[PDB]
Amino acid sequence: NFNFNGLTGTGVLTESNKKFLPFQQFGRDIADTTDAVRDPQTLEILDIT
Amino acid sequence: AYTNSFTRGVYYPDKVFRSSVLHSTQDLFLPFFSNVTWFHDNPVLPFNDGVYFASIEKSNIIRGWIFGTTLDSKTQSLLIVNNATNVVIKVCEFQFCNDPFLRVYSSANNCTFEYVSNLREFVFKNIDGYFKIYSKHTPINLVRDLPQGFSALEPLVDLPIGINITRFQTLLALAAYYVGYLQPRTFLLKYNENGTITDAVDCALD
Ligand SMILES: *[C@@H]1O[C@H](CO)[C@@H](O[C@@H]2O[C@H](CO)[C@@H](O)[C@H](O)[C@H]2NC(C)=O)[C@H](O)[C@H]1NC(C)=O
Ligand SMILES: *[C@@H]1O[C@H](CO)[C@@H](O[C@@H]2O[C@H](CO)[C@@H](O)[C@H](O)[C@H]2NC(C)=O)[C@H](O)[C@H]1NC(C)=O
Ligand SMILES: *[C@@H]1O[C@H](CO)[C@@H](O[C@@H]2O[C@H](CO)[C@@H](O)[C@H](O)[C@H]2NC(C)=O)[C@H](O)[C@H]1NC(C)=O
Ligand SMILES: *[C@@H]1O[C@H](CO)[C@@H](O)[C@H](O)[C@H]1NC(C)=O
Ligand SMILES: *[C@@H]1O[C@H](CO)[C@@H](O)[C@H](O)[C@H]1NC(C)=O
Numbered sequence: 001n002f003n004f005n006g007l008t009g010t011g012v013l014t015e016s017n018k019k020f021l022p023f024q025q026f027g028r029d030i031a032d033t034t035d036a037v038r039d040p041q042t043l044e045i046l047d048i049t
Numbered sequence: 050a051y052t053n054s055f056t057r058g059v060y061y062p063d064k065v066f067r068s069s070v071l072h073s074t075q076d077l078f079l080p081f082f083s084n085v086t087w088f089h090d091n092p093v094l095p096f097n098d099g100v101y102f103a104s105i106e107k108s109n110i111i112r113g114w115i116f117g118t119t120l121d122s123k124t125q126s127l128l129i130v131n132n133a134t135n136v137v138i139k140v141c142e143f144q145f146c147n148d149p150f151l152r153v154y155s156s157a158n159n160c161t162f163e164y165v166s167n168l169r170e171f172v173f174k175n176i177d178g179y180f181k182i183y184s185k186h187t188p189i190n191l192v193r194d195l196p197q198g199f200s201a202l203e204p205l206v207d208l209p210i211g212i213n214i215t216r217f218q219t220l221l222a223l224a225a226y227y228v229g230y231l232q233p234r235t236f237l238l239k240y241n242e243n244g245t246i247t248d249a250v251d252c253a254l255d
Contacts, residue, residue, distance in 0.1 A: 019243050020066050023204040027066035036066060 002048075004037045009048060016045040052195055054083040054229050058101040059236065059249045060172050060183035060202035068244035073252075077174060077231035081251035085195075085229035091148065091219040093120065096175070099231035100217065103170040105192055106224045112151045113220040116173075118213050120145050122158060127180065127212050130220060138164040140210055149220045162210045168195075172202055174231070175214045182206040193225045201246035 001010045007026070016036050018027060027036030027045075036047050058079030079085075079101040086094075096116060104111050113136075117126035122142045130137050130153065141157035168187040174180065183202035190196075219226065237250040 018066060018068065021061070021203060021244070023061075023064050023207075024066045025064050027068075030070060 005040050007034060007037060009034060011048040014047040014049060016047045018045055018047070020045045050087040052085050052087045052227060054079050054081060054085050054101070055195060055197050056081045056199050056249070056251075057103070057170065057195070058172060058202075058229060058231075059199070059238070059246060061204060061246060062236075062238070064204070066244050067240040069242050070240050072238050072240060073235055074238060075233065075235045077176070078234045078236050078251070079172070079229045080232050080234055081249075081254045083229055083232075085227045088219075088226050088228070089224065091221060093216050093218060094228060095230075096173075096214045096217045097230045098233070099175065100173045101171070101229040101231065102173065102226070103168060103195065104224060104226035105168045105189065105194075107192055110222055110224040111169075111219060111226065112222055114173075114217055115143075115145065115149060115153070115220070116175075116212065116214045116217045118215045120216050120218070122156075125159065125161060125212055127210065127214065128153070129182075136166045138162075138206070138208070140212060149218055150223055151220060153220060162208065164206065164208060166206075170202055171205075172231070173217075175212065178209065178211045180208045180210050180212060180214075195225075195227055199248060201249075 029035040062074040062076045113130040122144045128139045140162035141160040144155045172183040182205045184205045185202045235252040239248040241247045
C-alpha cells in the first residue's frame with residue numbers, strides 16, 4: 001500500500017523508465033487509474049503496477 | 050497586420066505524464082490556422098481569455114510583459130520583466146509610464162506577490178484565479194517570419210495569484226512578434242513513446 005501526497009493506492013513501486021518532464025507529478029493509465037508517480041522527497045519517478 | 054497560426058500554440062494541458070496515447074482535452078488553445086496579429090510598437094493589446102505570444106530575436110530585443118484590467122494604480126497589475134540578469138515577476142498596483150521601454154513604472158503599492166528566476170513562443174492563461182506561462186525557444190532558419198511545423202510548449206511558470214486581466218503590453222530595449230488569442234477548443238493530442246506531444250488535431254478546424 002502507499003500514500004503519495006494523499007494519493008492512496010496499492011502496487012509494486014518499480015523504478016520507472018518513463019521520462020517525466022520536470023513539471024509532471026503523476027502518470028495516468030488509459031483508465032484514470034494512476035500509472036506512475038513522482039516521489040515527493042527524492043523526486044524520482046516510480047511505476048505503479 | 051495578420052498572419053496564420055500555422056498549427057503552432059499547443060501546450061501540455063495537464064501536469065500529467067501521458068504516453069503512447071491519444072488524449073482529448075477541451076481547453077483554451079490557439080486554433081489551427083487562426084488569425085494572429087503581427088507587429089515589429091507595443092500597443093495596449095487585448096488579452097481576452099488568453100494569449101499565444103511569439104517573437105524572433107537574435108539580440109534580446111524584448112524585455113517582458115505587463116497585464117491587468119487598467120494597467121493603472123487603481124487595480125493590481127501583473128508584470129514580468131526579463132532584465133539584463135533575471136526574470137522578475139511582480140503583482141502590484143503599479144503606476145506605469147506611457148511606454149514601458151528599458152522606465153516601465155514610477156512606483157508600486159498594495160503588492161500581493163513576487164516570483165524570481167531563435168523563435169521564442171509563450172502561452173499565457175489566467176483562469177479560475179491562476180495565471181500560467183507555457184513556453185518553448187525554437188531554432189529556425191530566418192529572423193523575421195513565423196514558421197510552419199509543430200512543437201508543444203512546456204509549462205514554465207504557474208502562479209496562484211488571482212488577477213483580472215483584459216490588457217497587456219510588450220517591454221522593449223532602447224523585432225517581429227505575433228499575438229494570437231486562445232479559444233475553448235477540443236484538441237486530440239498525440240503523446241508519443243517519450244510522452245512528449247508530437248502532434249495534434251484541432252477538432253473544430255474542418
Ligand atoms: C534584475 O532583477 C533582479 C531581481 O530579481 C535584481 O536582483 C537584486 O539585486 C540586488 C543588487 O543589485 C540585490 O541586493 C537583491 O537582493 C536582488 N534581488 C533579488 C530578488 O534577487 C537584479 O539586480 C537586476 N539586475 C540588474 C542588472 O539590475
Ligand atoms: C490600496 O488598496 C486599498 C483597497 O484595497 C485602498 O484603500 C482605501 O484607502 C483609503 C485611504 O486609506 C481609504 O480612505 C479607503 O476607504 C480605502 N478603501 C477601502 C475599500 O477600504 C488604498 O487606497 C490603496 N492604496 C493607495 C496608496 O491608494
Ligand atoms: C526519445 O528521447 C530520446 C532522448 O532520450 C531521443 O533520442 C535522441 O535523439 C536525438 C535526435 O537528434 C539524438 O541526437 C540523441 O543522441 C538521442 N539520444 C539518445 C539517448 O538516444 C529519441 O529520439 C526520442 N524519441 C522520440 C520518438 O521522440
Ligand atoms: C527531502 O528528502 C530527500 C530524501 O528523502 C532529500 O534528498 C531531499 O533533499 C529533501 N528535501 C529538502 C528540501 O530538504
Ligand atoms: C483577420 O481579422 C481581422 C479582424 O480582426 C479581419 O479584418 C481580417 O479579414 C481577418 N483575416 C482573415 C484571413 O480572416
